[PDB]
Design an enzyme around this catalytic site. Sequence first.
Site, PDB file in Angstrom:
ATOM      1  N   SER A 108       0.991  -1.280   0.418  1.00  0.00           N
ATOM      2  CA  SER A 108      -0.114  -0.285   0.352  1.00  0.00           C
ATOM      3  C   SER A 108       0.653   1.238  -0.233  1.00  0.00           C
ATOM      4  O   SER A 108       1.547   1.360  -1.217  1.00  0.00           O
ATOM      5  CB  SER A 108      -0.821  -0.082   1.397  1.00  0.00           C
ATOM      6  N   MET A 109       0.770   2.397   0.552  1.00  0.00           N
ATOM      7  CA  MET A 109       1.780   3.155   1.488  1.00  0.00           C
ATOM      8  C   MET A 109       2.633   3.237   0.551  1.00  0.00           C
ATOM      9  O   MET A 109       4.254   3.715   0.398  1.00  0.00           O
ATOM     10  CB  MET A 109       0.842   4.326   2.196  1.00  0.00           C
ATOM     11  N   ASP A 155      -6.306  -6.795  -4.455  1.00  0.00           N
ATOM     12  CA  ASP A 155      -4.955  -6.962  -3.870  1.00  0.00           C
ATOM     13  C   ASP A 155      -4.418  -7.360  -4.696  1.00  0.00           C
ATOM     14  O   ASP A 155      -3.143  -7.096  -3.628  1.00  0.00           O
ATOM     15  CB  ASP A 155      -5.587  -7.837  -2.843  1.00  0.00           C
TER      16      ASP A 155
END
Lengths: 167, 167, 169, 167, 167, 167, 167, 169, 167, 167, 167, 167
Positions: E84-85, E148
């Site tokens: 993610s980040m 995902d």
Amino acid sequence: SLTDSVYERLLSERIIFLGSEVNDEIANRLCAQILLLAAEDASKDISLYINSPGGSISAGMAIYDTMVLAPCDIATYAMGMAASMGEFLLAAGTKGKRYALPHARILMHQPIAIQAEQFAVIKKEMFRLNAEFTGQPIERIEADSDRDRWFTAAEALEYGFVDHIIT
Amino acid sequence: SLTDSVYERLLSERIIFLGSEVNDEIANRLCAQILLLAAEDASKDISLYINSPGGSISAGMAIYDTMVLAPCDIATYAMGMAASMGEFLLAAGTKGKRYALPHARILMHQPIAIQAEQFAVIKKEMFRLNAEFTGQPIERIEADSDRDRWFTAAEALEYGFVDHIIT
Amino acid sequence: SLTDSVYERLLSERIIFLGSEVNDEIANRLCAQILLLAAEDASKDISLYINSPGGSISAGMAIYDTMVLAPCDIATYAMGMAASMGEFLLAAGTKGKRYALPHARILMHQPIAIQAEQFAVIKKEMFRLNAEFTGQPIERIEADSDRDRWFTAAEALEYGFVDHIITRA
Amino acid sequence: SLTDSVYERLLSERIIFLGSEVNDEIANRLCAQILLLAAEDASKDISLYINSPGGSISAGMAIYDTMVLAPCDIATYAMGMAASMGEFLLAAGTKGKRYALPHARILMHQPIAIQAEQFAVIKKEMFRLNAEFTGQPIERIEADSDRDRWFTAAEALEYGFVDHIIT
Amino acid sequence: SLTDSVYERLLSERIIFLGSEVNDEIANRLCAQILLLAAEDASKDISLYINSPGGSISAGMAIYDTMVLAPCDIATYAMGMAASMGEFLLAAGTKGKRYALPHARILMHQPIAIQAEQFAVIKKEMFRLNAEFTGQPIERIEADSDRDRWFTAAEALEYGFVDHIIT
Amino acid sequence: SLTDSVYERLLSERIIFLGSEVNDEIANRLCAQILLLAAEDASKDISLYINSPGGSISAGMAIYDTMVLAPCDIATYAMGMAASMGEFLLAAGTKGKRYALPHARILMHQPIAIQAEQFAVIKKEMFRLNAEFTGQPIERIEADSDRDRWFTAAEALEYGFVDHIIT
Amino acid sequence: SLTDSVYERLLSERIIFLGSEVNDEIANRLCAQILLLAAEDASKDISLYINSPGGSISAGMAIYDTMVLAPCDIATYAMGMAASMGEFLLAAGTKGKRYALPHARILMHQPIAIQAEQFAVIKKEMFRLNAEFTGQPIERIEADSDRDRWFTAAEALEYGFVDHIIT
Amino acid sequence: SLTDSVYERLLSERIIFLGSEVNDEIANRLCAQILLLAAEDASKDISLYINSPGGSISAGMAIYDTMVLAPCDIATYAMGMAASMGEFLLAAGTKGKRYALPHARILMHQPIAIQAEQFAVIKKEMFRLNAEFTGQPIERIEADSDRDRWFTAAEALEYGFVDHIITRA
Amino acid sequence: SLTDSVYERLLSERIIFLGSEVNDEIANRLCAQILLLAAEDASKDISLYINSPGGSISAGMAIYDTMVLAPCDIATYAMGMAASMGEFLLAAGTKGKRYALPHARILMHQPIAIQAEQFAVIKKEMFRLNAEFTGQPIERIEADSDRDRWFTAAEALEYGFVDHIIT
Amino acid sequence: SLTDSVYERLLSERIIFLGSEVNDEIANRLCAQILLLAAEDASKDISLYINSPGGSISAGMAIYDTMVLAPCDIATYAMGMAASMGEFLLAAGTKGKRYALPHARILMHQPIAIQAEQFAVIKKEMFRLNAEFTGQPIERIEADSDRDRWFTAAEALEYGFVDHIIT
Amino acid sequence: SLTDSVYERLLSERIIFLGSEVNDEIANRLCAQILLLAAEDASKDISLYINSPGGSISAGMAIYDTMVLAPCDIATYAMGMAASMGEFLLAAGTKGKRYALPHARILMHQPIAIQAEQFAVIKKEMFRLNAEFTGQPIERIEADSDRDRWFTAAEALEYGFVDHIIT
Amino acid sequence: SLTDSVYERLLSERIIFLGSEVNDEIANRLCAQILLLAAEDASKDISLYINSPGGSISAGMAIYDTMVLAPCDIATYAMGMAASMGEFLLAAGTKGKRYALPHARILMHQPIAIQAEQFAVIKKEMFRLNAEFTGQPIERIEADSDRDRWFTAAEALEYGFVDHIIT
């Protein structure tokens, strides 16, 4: 830490503190400092500032013995409270270099079977030395410890615990 | 911490402290300081200051063996208490350089099957060396240990624990 | 801290300590130090002072491998107690430079399928090197270890753990 | 701490340790040490000493990746245990420069939907790399891990985790 | 500590690390590091090694915002996970200087009423920038985050997160 | 304690609560209560009130199996939240006897190698059963679970999770 | 424990208490208590005493649904503070049987994308029922919460939260 | 406490629970409950519900011996998971009174010198009895355990772990 | 526990205690107690024994309202201290049945914007009802509280806190 | 607690457990149970179930002494492990009623100068008793214990620890 | 607990214990018990066993106030130590029914501006009542308090603390 | 608790336990128990089982005093160890009813400086009664305490602590 840093720095100006109850840890730390300063320079004064409710007589006597051992003078200062062994160490400073801050309070206090034996003998000796320090007669010291007699800076100079009140 | 810095700085002056009860930890730390000073400079004296209720014999004999190991003389000072192994280590300093401070107290003290036989052996050996250090017969060391005999600085000089009382 | 500070300071004097139970982390610290000294100067002695109730054979065996690995002579000294792998490591010192201080004690001590296999191998190797070290028959070693035989300094020099009882340096 | 001061000093000699389980944190620590040393000097050897039960595969592959990344030669040493990823990173060192200390043990060990997917890839990839490092076929590596096959220095040399047994 | 010491030493090498979750705490530490480096030398490259499960969007953008603000180039390295980040900040590195290590793994993930309003714009803007960094269409960035989608190094290069795979 | 006494007197009225997240401990506890009641009387209604964020499918399935196991009818009540396994267990009530309170909320949420395998099995069985409970087709159950579709008491009555909205 | 013991005995006089913040656990036990008394005797009143800072809307709303569900009359008593959901549940008593004690104070207060969604519909609902409860216009209910309007027992009777003030 | 009260209430109906990791403590409590029921009425069944990840063999085997000791029959019911010793204790119920619920799962699993010895012995005993309970050869039970074989209720009925899949009580 | 068993048995004799500080927990417990006793028998007296440093004014007032609520008389006894709200409550007793024990002492004491108003309101009400219970002007009450006036039983009787001193 | 409830109820059936390590508290509790049972019905058997690592020899001997004291027959069962004192107490059961369960294991184990004295006595005494119990010679008891000899149920029956193996 | 279980059983024998330092909690518990026993039966004696170092004068006086309050006779028993308020409450026993056990010991101990004020008044009251209870002049009570006079059972009969030494 | 329950059940059989260090708590526990049993039936025998490392004299003296006070005979049983006050209490039993289990061990031990005076009188008085219990002269009690003389059951029976050894 900040706190320790400032003490270390003060110790470099030959200024040490008794700022808690006298016990073996404190006594050892204090004797240590006195041995250090004495070792570092035998001729410069040490300043012992005192804000202490006193405590263990054994502890204080080791401290006093170290004070006596060091060649240099030890100036003492009552900073907020000198009670029992706190008082005794205050009174024990080099004569003419004992000081009370203007609002310091000097307080006196009355401080198995073999422990009582060992206690009795050094209580007596502390009373003896306290008389020597203050010029007071031994019976004065004895009664005043029973009655928990407390002193103002002024009253304490009167009695003989200090030689100066520094405004 | 301040306390540690102060001990380190005293270490640089070849001044050392047995300030608590003798155990494996403190033993190792003291031995370590002795080996350090001996390694730094075989020539100069180490001064060991004692204010200890003592404790374990093996712990104590471990320090003793290291003191013997160091080629330089160790001066021992009874600063507050010297009891049990505290006393033993005091009496174990270099002949001519054992000091009691005027208000110090010396206390002698009576201190799995395989553990029993190990203890019996050092116990006995400790008496043997105590007698050697003090100039007393073994039998008076044993009887004085059995009863918890205590000494003022004065009484301790007579007996043989120290060579001088220093003021 | 003071304690640590004198150990570092003592390290620069090429003197090291096994002062407690030989487990995995202490064994690592110790190997690290031998490696460090070795690497700093490869032909000056290292002095190892032991006062330790021993520990695992595994960790003990790791300190030993590092001792052999290191080019310089490692001098060993029995300070207080040399038990189990403390005994093994004392005896493991450079031949001629293993010492007892006069009141040191030397204690011998008998120290999943696949762990047991591993243990058996290392346990047998340990008895074999203790023999090599002391001049004793493996038989003596096992039976003495079995009955937790212990030794004064004098008795320990006789048996072969050390080469000298040292009093003054 | 003394422990930390030693590792730092050892790290000035281009020596690093893998002395515990391989988790994400240790892996980060170790990856960092490799990058530091490779950035300090990219022509000199680094010495990885391994005594560890191994652990996380992806954490082990990150260290591995960092060794590969590092321009300089990484030598490895089986100091006590080299198990699972520890064994992987031993075998992963620069060829010619993989050592086993005589009494070292080398152990092989079998190391939501989407976690299985990643793990399956990573597992296969590490079997592949073990086979490449050892010279053993892939299917031999799998059967051996499955039955927790372990090795002495001797057996490890012959099988191909290491190049030399030092004394 | 050793761990911290190593990290500071790598800062002198202009190497920094995002190796845990991305939150307020870490974000600040890392913005501070970028700011130091840009202040120390504005022209020299900063290296950012990422191995991190990502985390807070607002924290990540603070870091990104700091990265853009730094005059110098910021090379980014996928070392463990970049998720993610963690993935956003990797893809945000200076074009041409975005690296995956061979076994690195890139993961995409979907990442009081006023709070939701705020979140919606930050979420949108993140998608926009992730689209820009990878050259992928916003639609694909959204769908891929929904499901995902994860990536081997090779798959990551193909998609646009990185410019290079280092061997 | 108060709470316990209240649940326990409610058990005498054959009323059961699922009032926190479904794990193995809550499973075992619920299955026990069901079994006790069933054992006490195999042909009186059980009333199960639900206010739960759901949780573990496997745990959810053990409660489900036990509900089915129990001879007597089980009534279900969405009391506040029925999410994921909470929803599923509400749906699994005896047809005709599923109830929603007017402000109840039904949430649908899509919830090593061998671990994944097992999970995939019951995931599918869970979906299939949800379809059967609601009359909806499988692909709608999945699609809705993907986007975390939620339902008001009304919306949920229409879809088939409950039979009555009770006032 | 005494406390639980009094609450149990009170539960027998059909008296229950909202004496703390309204959260999920408290809401659970309160619903449990209503259910039990309702099961025990559907014809007799329940007395609910309130001294609560209020809490979560969902929680309060489950309590509300359960009250509605309880066949018997529920009389409410503002005992100390009736704040937020505390006010709502107070106002929710059976018309005719809602009381405030003379020094009761009634406080109104205005109480991931799916989270906001859900909140908004229940926040609207709760505003509507406060309106219906008090007979006030919805606009006034809303604006009054905005400004955290508070009421004395007398002001609250006037506004419609309660039917009687008891003395 | 409520939890403890219903289990006690359930003991009254001769129903007992294996709902956590089998260890020394759990087994102690479980052996006790079996001994208590057998002492209460020796002529009457004990139902045992298993939802357990298994664990220690010795603990498992101690429960087993108490099952064997109890004069009465013991009906086992795989309620959710029966894994490792969980599987064993399930398989050990009286022939014809071992049940699985529709969605139970059954997991087989392959579970100092003196320890290794005692462990080897009990392991062998564990495989042999499992073989006996399920009707499989020891060889298969080894191989499967090795490979962590698992089983839906149906696959479990077919292998021998259980006698019935029970749906309604 | 014995402490609680004793209080339970006192409750069964219609005797209650205010033995500690007045926090909300306590006032809740105490209100519940009075509620119960009233519900058990509306005709028989309640004896309330006070030995409390007072505390919260809302908590105070909640108890007060409850005492007013109960149809039965409540006798109040100053057991050791009755300070602030404890005094208030003491004086709140049924007229003719407010007692002090002979060595009880009665002590007076002074007990975000929206909170301030509420406090001001409770505080004013407090002063008023205390003026009315004792028969003293609000101004005497206020000034006497400002200076922490305390009273012996005799003095408390004289001032109007109580009706009898008991022996 | 359920556990305690069950042991309590089992104690009503005259069934006791030694289930953890022998130590003063547990020995005391076990003795008490024996005294209790014995006082309740001095003619009906006590059944002692053992699965214990044994422990302190003195504690073990006090249990033994209470067994001898107890007029009724005491049957012993080896349940899990009967080790050291656990083994001894098992062997010490009324001859004819010592039982091993088929997978029970029996382990023998080798169990301040004043401490050694006391210990030697009890040890010798405990070997003597273990010799009498099992019919083996004392010196076989000692060598066996020396090497930690263990036994299967059959081996134990053969050696003399038990009288039946139950199935 | 067993202990509580015994104390409550003894309560049924109208036997109570003051067995630790008199503080506020203790005094609350003891006043409660006395009250409870008074309520249970005002015509039958209470027996109070004292083994207490005493403490708080005012807690002490609360207990005493309850003692006088209770219509029934209170026997007191100096069971071990009765020091400070322990002595006082012992001596408050109903004259003729104050007892001492043969080895009991009695001790007398001398026990913000406003705290001082109240304390001076209660100290005086206590001295007055000690005189009352024993028949000694107030001056002996004070003088004997200062120095801390202790008493054997016999010396205690003689002074007036108790009426009989019970065997 | 099971442990508590068993002791409770034992109290119905008039069996009590001294199974730990004698102190204030235990002493009170034990006197309470003795007082109870006596109050319950004045003739029926009390049985005290002792397994205790002694404790403090004052506490032990209090228990002794309660025993003597108790009308009925008290049987004493040396269970595992009777030391210090454990020995005393054992020896203090009704003559002809003091027992020792065969492997029991009786150990005799040596048990503001005004404490010393209190402790001196009480040390002497214990010795006196200890002499009287056995039939040994005061001096024998002292010296035998001094070197910590321990006894077997046989030795103790003949020395006078017990009347009977039971088997």
